[PDB]
Amino acid sequence: GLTEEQRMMIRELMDAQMKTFDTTFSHFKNFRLPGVAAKWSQVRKDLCSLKVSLQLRGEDGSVWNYKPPADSKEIFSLLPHMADMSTYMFKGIISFAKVISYFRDLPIEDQISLLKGAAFELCQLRFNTVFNAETGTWECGRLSYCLEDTAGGFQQLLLEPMLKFHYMLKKLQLHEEEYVLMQAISLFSPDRPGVLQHRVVDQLQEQFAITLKSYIECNRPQPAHRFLFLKIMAMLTELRSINAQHTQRLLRIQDIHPFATPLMQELFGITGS
Template sequence: MESILCEAIKLEFEAYTSVSPCSGSSRELNEVERAKLNELIVANKALHAPIDDDVTQLVGETASSAGFKGGDGKHDPRLITIVNLTAVAIRRFIKMAKKINAFKNMCEEDQVALLKGGCIEMMVLRSTMTYDGQRKQWKIPHCQEQFGSIRTDVLKLAKGNIYRSHDSFIRSFEARWRTDEHVILIMSAILLFTPDRPKVVHPDVIKLEQNSYYYLLRRYLESVYPGCEAKSTFLKLIQKILELRKLAEEVTGVYLDVNPIEPLLMEIFDLKHHAA
């Protein structure tokens, strides 16, 4: 926890150089802060388009290619379909990122590096918004197809302890935080602008942008919670970001173990080919 505190203190001071300080002592977001949050809200509309056609096409393609080599039953078709549904989400996260000015203004190399490194983390974070703890399932919004909901039991089909890891993560992620779309949007931006991704060219520029979103997260929390609660929540959400990155590594391991895998995922993971 001490390292989290140190990071929070460092971010608090660095962030003041990233964003113009708010005038006065008002807890409400100022004009600059509201504009930065509104940009994320507008960009987020890319995730709201109906996905039925995408799901139908993907399920059809997966079914037609699910003749596993060797026929050893290693990969359950349900798990393959769920994994490849990720491709639908990733396409939307790419569209979302391209609507953020700071991202658009970065060089192509950094854009690619940030998307490859951050898509899975953003997807895992986003999925917490639609998780129903009582029914142990995710509700896929804007979808009327057979995959309108997905039971987390499907994670038991994967190797490792991904089901247990996800359950532990979601239980410790308070519903009032993970169902607050503003919190999730800002946390998604923090994940997107992570400067230590492989093949990043300008980490200092990316870190500056990430710090501005840490600052925005702290300011947003100050605008909706009392002072001490806002700071406590800020620290806990920083911790959740670190935990989420570890969980996303486990999720990625599941994806790399599945065959067949959707072409976009092969590109995200830099796979030349994927054999069972």
């Protein structure tokens, strides 16, 4: 069974999730939409792997739908929108952290350092919960983002680590509690740059990990869920690698075509000079 401390820990994480995860995206509005040297550009074409169409269902019953263009200087038409969605998600993640007592008690410098290290990872973890793996679409209330079908199909889509990560994590069919513990483990990473209380964060991380392992042991006896704890930890390590690569991806794009919002600039360390 879970201890009283472990049950309290999960409850506080679920409470935070409940309060700060707008699962229907109802307060996401007033966002931008697409209109109605050489080596750096070629690497920036990295964007092709993440191609998505966009659907917006109106409250009145109307449906707007956007198919993006082929590559060739207009592969940036969707960046402002994605910047606005990412920003909206980041705010939710920041609120999540701030309502957790284990995070509130850390020094303000470590709070910021932990948020800059983990914001992308937490975003992806929340996005996985609205991912429909059958249709390859993220369902964000009135908005939907659907992967565009390419020559290799389902196989070729899994070559992009981000996309493969979303498919693999969804296949584990995790509970809400397991997702929120993944968020905690990722948030409380003692080895992010600029962390001062490395011992406290490490100990906290271990308690979340132990709580997740015990939750799984107590609630998932089936042969399918053997090694689930270790599969989850391997996915978080993978996600951290995806984070570092996609961070460099976004910074390269930002160098050629500015798109990052002020909040994104904060989290990515862009000063404005």
